[PDB]
Amino acid sequence: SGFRKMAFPSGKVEGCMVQVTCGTTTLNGLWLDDVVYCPRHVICTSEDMLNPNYEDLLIRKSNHNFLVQAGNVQLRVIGHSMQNCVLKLKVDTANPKTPKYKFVRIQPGQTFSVLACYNGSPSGVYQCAMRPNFTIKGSFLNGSCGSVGFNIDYDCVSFCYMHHMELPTGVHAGTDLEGNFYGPFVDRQTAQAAGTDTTITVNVLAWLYAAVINGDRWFLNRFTTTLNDFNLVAMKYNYEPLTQDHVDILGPLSAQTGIAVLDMCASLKELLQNGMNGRTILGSALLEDEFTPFDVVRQCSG
Amino acid sequence: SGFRKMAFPSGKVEGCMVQVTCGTTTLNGLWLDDVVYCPRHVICTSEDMLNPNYEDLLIRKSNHNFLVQAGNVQLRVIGHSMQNCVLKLKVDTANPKTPKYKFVRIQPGQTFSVLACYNGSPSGVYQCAMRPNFTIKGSFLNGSCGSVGFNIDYDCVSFCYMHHMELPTGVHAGTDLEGNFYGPFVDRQTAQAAGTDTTITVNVLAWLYAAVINGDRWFLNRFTTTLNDFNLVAMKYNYEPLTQDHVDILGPLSAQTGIAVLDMCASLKELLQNGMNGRTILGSALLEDEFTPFDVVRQCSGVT
Ligand SMILES: O=C(N[C@H]1CCCC[C@H]1Nc1c(C(=O)N2CCOCC2)cc(Br)cc1[N+](=O)[O-])c1cc(=O)[nH]c2ccccc12
Ligand SMILES: O=C(N[C@H]1CCCC[C@H]1Nc1c(C(=O)N2CCOCC2)cc(Br)cc1[N+](=O)[O-])c1cc(=O)[nH]c2ccccc12
């Protein structure tokens, strides 16, 4: 029993973190085989960031303009190139702690663990969801760029996020490990803002199943509702529409608890237009949307 | 910017987790140097659990009744002894991945990270507080016993919790690495119940400081308070009383924000009186009490 916001164990990823310095900028790099991956803005001065020409800036650098430190050993850089917004630094030593890994690009609504790092050293791990507006509500200070987000399946690390920036509202933006940005953002110091966000409805329903699994049942009701009748109510409260595929993805949880998906929607609808009336669910006064159906199944089954 | 319930990186502890089996009972062990630590109830059948005499049960065991597995490798058990509620299995191999470590016993209100494990394999990490009633609000299933809680200070892992059981209300109880339970709980399947819990007041204040550090001031007010008036009010909301040691512990946060501790106490009093009125603080609609002052300074300063 119990339900916590649980991150994946971070050991496989700690073994890949390094410090990348170029000029006056120091940040974090990801060391996999004989390549270090890090944000391309490491090569910019603050004046460069106002309007950077990365191709032109990178040509002015040689391999010796990059210092890479893993622990107390300085890795020799033998080549450099860009892929989209990530810099790839070839080093003369392969990382012996390189795990089985893949680069994957995730969708809004999917969760992942973040290993927050500074100067190549881990500070902590936490669990994040990609918001529908493609930001993440992270915890990042100066020097955090290059920290990565990831999932683990069996022995294989799926890197999905590399951190690049903080927006004026204090939320964060980054790229996949192929350097493609999540959301309409650019690595330039210019006016940028997070769009209006919505709530990940499939994740809220999964978390309501987690609460029922853990004995919170006061919000279940006698009513039922159609998917289109629910979707019309949800859209008025800035909730993402529920698709039929979402319902199929909630099948396992509905079978475990015996509560039809549309019966849980009927409860969620009543929660949205009535509130919680001073009560809590799993220790929260808000409807939580940073647990996917798979996350609930995993934590409630090992 | 931002504020998250952040756990310590788990790598140094991941390399210490093993699987311990005795009979048909399996659970997790902690392998440090040539010793594996685990809950002593690994030697019990379910019939033994109502009124076990662990001295009598252990004397009937031999070294070869314990199978300890680290990955695909079996570790030969060469000795065994009990210390309070933990079993110490000596093995013929010292753990090459042993970190620098310490055994500590924490206070009510302090936090630590839990590496939840099953069959010797870590499956997740999260941050916990020792509640005032000496339980933790964990996430644990059958097979999780022997999972550990820990902090990191400098280069050293401070182990502070080993998991033993789940109480009827779904909260959790365990021991330090000496085998002494937190609270009045015992490793018997007898009627046990968490007492009534309280809110960790010094942690709520530290968290309000994190909100200020992150740029929010809407909950401050022009009032101050005496410490004794603050405690008279706060205890009517089932908040733990605030001591002068606590006030000194909030010093660094108070000095960084320019808000005196007793002025933050005034704000807390008003929050308890009014609630948030449809607002949130660092993403929460309730007053969070599972961040210590040291947690706040660490996450707001980038300690690695
Ligand atoms: O070091 C961080 N950022 C650097 C990294 C490389 C240089 C540009 C900058 N990134 C941004 C930012 C930005 O982060 N800031 C933060 C406030 O000051 C300026 C604007 C905004 C836009 Br718009 C575009 C970019 N960009 O294109 O890289 C940074 C990261 C973090 O998560 N949180 C922090 C908290 C405090 C201070 C710094 C950070
Ligand atoms: O395997 C777990 N526990 C086992 C470990 C071996 C000894 C007995 C039992 N510990 C207890 C418990 C207890 O946990 N339970 C669990 C529900 O059914 C019975 C009562 C209560 C008291 Br009172 C005393 C003890 N004791 O003395 O060990 C266990 C751990 C967990 O965190 N969460 C779970 C969720 C579901 C099922 C099991 C667990």
UniProtKB/Swiss-Prot annotation, chain A:
Changing residue 205 to V: In strain: Zeta/P.2. Inhibited by pyridone-containing alpha-ketoamides compounds 13a and 13b. In turn, alpha-ketoamide 13b (tert-butyl (1-((S)-1-(((S)-4-(benzylamino)-3,4-dioxo-1-((S)-2-oxopyrrolidin-3-yl)butan-2-yl)amino)-3-cyclopropyl-1-oxopropan-2-yl)-2-oxo-1,2-dihydropyridin-3-yl)carbamate) inhibits SARS-CoV-2 replication in human lung cells. Inhibited ex vivo by michael acceptor inhibitor N3. Inhibited ex vivo by compound 11a and 11b. Residues 1-302 are cytoplasmic. Residues 1-302 form the Peptidase C30 domain. It catalyses: TSAVLQ-|-SGFRK-NH2 and SGVTFQ-|-GKFKK the two peptides corresponding to the two self-cleavage sites of the SARS 3C-like proteinase are the two most reactive peptide substrates. The enzyme exhibits a strong preference for substrates containing Gln at P1 position and Leu at P2 position. The active site is at residues 41, 145. There is a cross-link at residues 5, 90 (Glycyl lysine isopeptide (Lys-Gly) (interchain with G-Cter in ubiquitin)). It is found in: Host cytoplasm; Host Golgi apparatus; Host nucleus. 3CL-PRO exists as monomer and homodimer. Only the homodimer shows catalytic activity. Interacts with host FBXO22; this interaction promotes the proteasomal degradation of nsp5. Cleaves the C-terminus of replicase polyprotein at 11 sites. Recognizes substrates containing the core sequence [ILMVF]-Q-|-[SGACN]. Cleaves and inactivates human TRMT1, preventing tRNA guanine(26)-dimethylation of tRNAs. May cleave human NLRP1 in lung epithelial cells, thereby activating the NLRP1 inflammasome pathway. May cleave human GSDMD, triggering alternative GSDME-mediated epithelial cell death upon activation of the NLRP1 inflammasome, which may enhance the release interleukins 1B, 6, 16 and 18. Also able to bind an ADP-ribose-1''-phosphate (ADRP). This is 3C-like proteinase nsp5. The lineage of its organism: Viruses, Riboviria, Orthornavirae, Pisuviricota, Pisoniviricetes. The chain holds residues 3264 to 3565 of 4405 of the full protein.
